[PDB]
Paper text:
During HIV-1 or HIV-2 infection, the capsid is a necessary component that protects the viral genome and recruits host factors while trafficking to the nucleus. In this study, we leveraged the approach of templating the HIV CA lattice assembly on liposomes, together with stabilization by the small-molecule host factor inositol hexakisphosphate (IP6),75–79 to produce regular HIV-2 CA lattices. We report the first high-resolution structures of HIV-2 CA capsomeres in their native mature lattice using single-particle cryo-EM.
The icosahedral pentamer was nearly identical to the pentamer from the CLPs with a model root-mean-square deviation (RMSD) of ~0.7 Å. Consistent with the high resolution, excellent density is observed, and we can confidently build an atomic model of the CA molecule in the assembly. Instead, the HIV-2 CA structures exhibit several additional polar contacts between adjacent chains, particularly between NTD helices 2 and 3, which could explain how they modulate forming pentamers and hexamers. We observed density for IP6 in the central pores of both HIV-2 CA hexamers and pentamers, with clear density for R18 side chains.
Numbering used by the authors:
A (entry chain A), B (entry chain A), C (entry chain A), D (entry chain A): 1 to 222
């Protein structure tokens, strides 16, 4: 992370060992589950690219997922090296502008990452861009390791409607389908895959029942 | 959060990553359960509106609940923009007074939030007002996702009276009913929905038995 | 319909009784089924609005569907009376420009409909605009009377994969859902709702199998 | 279609609505079955490319099959734009020669299609070339939707030999296999997949029995 010091300059404070150990624990227990994507973001907040590399280096043993996060990073960096091209011959005595690889931290020092992150002129938020690239990689890992598909989720005959709602929305988090497909699933598939009685109360509510109206109506049905 | 520095001025210290990661964990495990409302308050204590937005941004994937917390915030801000109207033409060189949107932090910088929070003259506690608005939103989410209704809760034939009391009061926390309805439930419904024997001992106690007297009397009955 | 005669002018030839009787038969046998929408278009080709009214008048007894086709026509005419407003004071000795009601034929003679349909200057195709409005009305009737929902369709244990494909696509024709939802259903729901064996061969094909590849692979499976 | 008028010139008479409605019915009932290919040819006889487009536009809802007929048309037009290249700079006051797209009618007026179809010099039969391209597309649709494969067809123990012959030849119509494979199937597979008794009478006939000899011999066997 970065702390400001007297003179208006900034320095690097290494991520706490227990901040790194929390990340490890999460990846070892949730197995790249939907929750890992937000868990990574909260534990990587205010981090330079250098620190994000260490967090990944602490969870490298999960090689399959790391290979997926690594192929997504290279592509989001290539797109940065195509749409943010070298401006031209950089003047001497000046830091080069960041390339996709600098945003990652692989070809750049943490100080360079800090100089960009806090440029008085055109600050480049290299830490947040790289966290966004890794979140695309982790979300692809959440989908690949997702244990139950949205379609398979079906309310148990006795299962309370809210727990069936809880499992239905958790699988939808993994789904990478178009947002309209997500809206049609929450409005059509969720009434389609409910136990016989809850299905009669939901159809009873009428057309386009909101989730609050559906949860309120099926509370204690079954 | 806010730390005071030499000169009598205040600065902003970003919420710790592990303070943010605790919030995520809670929302991912308690599923907007009654406990989330107090858990949010303890982890948002001494926060500017800016920080409260980040905590919410770390739990955005729970879109249904976030939509409910977001509709409650807009209404508590509209009521602030009606009962705390722009005083009139603000003098130049002065910070504008906060509007419902400034209390949220959406249309305002953290420094402005800090200047109000610590105004030498008429300090506006924007952080606490916004936490109160979100607590109304989370409490509506606790009620919507509540799995068991107060009425359905019924003591098991062998269930110890205290565990039946524990489940009865946990559902009452979710209930948004008038306080008198809450007092009549704790004094009438709790004796009505007890296993046959405990019901005879409670009626034996007499009229208006206190909870302590009821727990003491039914200890070891069944 | 319209025939051209010597002098460069056009006249009206009444729709054949057996062209009208075919329409009746279809509506009496397919019961506003998906097939009725194309059947109407083929039997209403080259028709003035006047003729389209008679076809509808021959199937008026189906009052519920006619009320739906009539509410859709009034709205598509109101939108025409808002986006194609009276240009201004029409000069004397000239036919007024068509309004939503003229496109229908209700407030206009067939000759006026023909004069517009074949205007040397800015011909307005009133017959085709009204056929399009009625097709929106019939398609809403196809959806309302659709007997099986896309989701319910599930391949029989012995049913050949192609017949299950035939029923799956016929229900999709009735579906008015967004096109992406239609693409996700044909690529995901169609493999999800197949009998156990065909489901194993389809997953065997790999990711994004085309319909031809799926029909070829499951031919004779079961 | 095209009618000749006084002066030696030709004009276009729009395909009858009931000629178009027959086509619709067939495609809606035979589901792109082998019979659709001949049914299309008889109902498209003496048609300009313009009319053939309308027939297809009346059966567009069958999107999967239409996509197959559309990919076959583009390829048969590309082959026409490669083997029948623009002759060179066309003289002014003259109709351009037809390209694959003109044969389809997509980039050409019906009058141009008629001028070519009835050129006094080098008439190009654009209507028949496009019908041939669509027949390749429909035949691919017959094969894709074919419900029973030639190999699977096996005479029922009681099924009369002629009905088994009827099903065997109907599946062979769908088969796109080399003609020799078609001759070997009709001479070997048809005796191989007959019920035990008919198989003994057919082997009894001797080597290379004609279909007439086989039908005559197995009449009333079983
Ligand atoms: O809530 P606490 O009583 O303070 O316990 C905390 C809590 O762990 P648990 O709540 O799951 O028991 C911390 O996690 P937070 O909820 O505060 O975010 C965790 O710190 P981590 O972020 O690293 O997980 C820390 O565990 P540890 O000390 O192993 O780092 C642990 O403190 P104690 O276990 O010492 O009570
Ligand atoms: O194919 P055909 O031998 O000419 O029979 C036709 C055919 O009806 P069917 O094919 O269903 O038996 C006509 O329909 P098309 O397929 O030609 O479009 C139909 O005319 P409609 O369009 O009005 O249905 C007409 O029936 P009808 O004479 O009652 O009008 C009928 O002719 P026949 O029944 O006299 O043989």
């Amino acid at each position: 992370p970065v702390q400001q010091t007297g003179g208006g300059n900034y320095i690097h404070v290494p991520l706490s060992p227990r901040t790194l150990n929390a990340w490890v624990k999460l990846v070892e227990d949730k197995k790249f589950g939907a929750e890992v994507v937000p868990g990574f973001q909260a534990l990587s907040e205010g981090c330079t690219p250098y620190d994000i590399n260490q967090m990944l280096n602490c969870v490298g043993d999960h090689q399959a997922a790391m290979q997926i996060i690594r192929e997504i990073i290279n592509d989001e960096a290539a797109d940065w090296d195509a749409q943010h091209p070298i401006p031209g011959p950089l003047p001497a005595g000046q830091l080069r502008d960041p390339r996709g690889s600098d945003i990652a931290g692989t070809t750049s020092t943490v100080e360079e990452q800090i100089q960009w992150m806090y440029r008085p002129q055109n600050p480049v938020p290299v830490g947040n861009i790289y966290r966004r690239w890794i979140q695309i990689g982790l979300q692809k890992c959440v989908r690949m390791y997702n244990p139950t598909n949205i379609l398979d989720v079906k309310q148990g005959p006795k299962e309370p409607f809210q727990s069936y709602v809880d499992r239905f929305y958790k699988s939808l988090r993994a789904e990478q389908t178009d947002p309209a497909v997500k809206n049609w699933m929450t409005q059509t598939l969720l009434i389609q895959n409910a136990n016989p009685d809850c299905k009669l109360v939901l159809k009873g509510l009428g057309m386009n029942p909101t989730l609050e109206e559906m949860l309120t109506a099926c509370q204690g049905v079954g």
